[PDB]
Ligand SMILES: [Pt+4]
C-alpha cells in the first residue's frame with residue numbers, strides 16, 4: 001500500500017509513535033517518506049547481503065528473518081515479509097525496539113541525512129489528527 005502523508009501520520013499516531021522516545025510525529029513521517037516513499041512494499045538490497053523491508057526499511061541483519069541473511073539476529077522476532085503488510089503494526093512495533101537501542105533515530109540513515117535538524121513539523125501540517 002502507498003500511504004498518503006496525512007493518512008500515515010494518523011496511523012502512526014494511533015500506533016503510539018507521536019513523541020515515542022522524544023521523537024515527534026513529524027520525524028517518523030519524514031523518515032518514512034525518504035526511506036520508502038510511503039510504500040509498505042519497498043525492499044532494497046544492501047552490499048553486505050542483508051535487505052531492508054517496508055515503510056521504515058528495517059534491516060534483515062538485525063531485526064527480522066528473511067531466510068537469506070547468514071548470521072542475522074531476528075531481534076523483532078518476525079519474518080521480514082510481515083513488514084511489507086498494508087497494516088503497519090509490525091513495522092511500528094519493530095521500529096519502537098530499534099529507536100530504543102541507544103542510537104535513537106540515527107539508526108535510519110535517511111532520517112539522519114534528510115530529516116534531522118529540519119523543520120519536521122511541516123510533514124504533519126494540515127493533517128486532521
Ligand atoms: Pt494494493
Ligand SMILES: [Pt+4]
Pocket residue numbers: 010011013014129
Ligand atoms: Pt487519529
Ligand SMILES: [Pt+4]
Pocket residue numbers: 011014015087088089
Ligand atoms: Pt493501523
Ligand SMILES: [Pt+4]
Pocket residue numbers: 010011014
Ligand atoms: Pt486509520
Ligand SMILES: [Pt+4]
Pocket residue numbers: 065066067068069070071072073
Ligand atoms: Pt536469517
